[PDB]
């Protein structure tokens, strides 16, 4: 356990915990989801909370959030997990991640990337130099 790790988890939690009251509500989740282009129903949002809500009180607190992370660090490799991740980027769903989409997704998730950083991130994964990242290239970067 390091200080830099805690800080990272703290800011991830803060992104969702809008009013900083120490809990993430279905309403707060909805806000972040909508800004990312997604449009879940109330039932879907509550479902998202319930799977991480260990004490079943209706909201997610820091310990539950941290536990979720620990469990996610165990397995990020399925297909459905990778596909799920790729789908977040591919906003329009045409099969490729463009620099514009990467920048938009990262900004709304609180990560400030420089134009140059965006391009380099894309370039490292762009196996066919077409300037985008398709599922295959995405999977190859994840599965290794």
């Amino acid at each position: 356990l390091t200080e830099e790790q805690i800080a990272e988890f703290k800011e991830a939690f803060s992104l969702f915990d809008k009013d900083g009251d120490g809990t993430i509500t279905t309403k707060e989740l909805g806000t972040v989801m909508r800004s990312l282009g997604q449009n879940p129903t109330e039932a879907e949002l509550q479902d998202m909370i319930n799977e991480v809500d260990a004490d079943g009180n209706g909201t997610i607190d820091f310990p539950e959030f941290l536990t979720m992370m620990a469990r996610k660090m165990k397995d990020t490799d399925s297909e459905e997990e990778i596909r799920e991740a790729f789908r977040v980027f591919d906003k329009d769903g045409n099969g490729y991640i463009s620099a514009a989409e990467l920048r938009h997704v990262m900004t709304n998730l609180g990560e400030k990337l420089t134009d140059e950083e965006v391009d380099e991130m894309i370039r490292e994964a762009d196996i066919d130099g077409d300037g985008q990242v398709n599922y295959e290239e995405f999977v190859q970067m994840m599965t290794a």
């Binding site: 990272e8 991830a12 992104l15 989740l29 972040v32 989801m33 990312l36 997604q38 879940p40 879907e44 998202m48 909370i49 799977e51 991480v52 997610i60 979720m68 992370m69 469990r71 996610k72 660090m73 990020t76 490799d77 997990e81 799920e84 991740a85 789908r87 977040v88 980027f89 997704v105 990262m106 998730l109 609180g110 990560e111 990337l113 950083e117 380099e120 991130m121 490292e124 994964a125 990242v133 995405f138 970067m141 994840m142 290794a144």
Partner: peptide, 24 residues
């Protein structure tokens, strides 16, 4: 729809400024 942990996974990648599992 994506899971909450998938969102944190993506944020971490952005944080590392690189694609690929940002943890392991």
């Amino acid at each position: 729809i994506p899971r909450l942990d998938t969102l944190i996974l993506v944020k971490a990648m952005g944080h590392r400024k690189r694609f690929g599992n940002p943890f392991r």
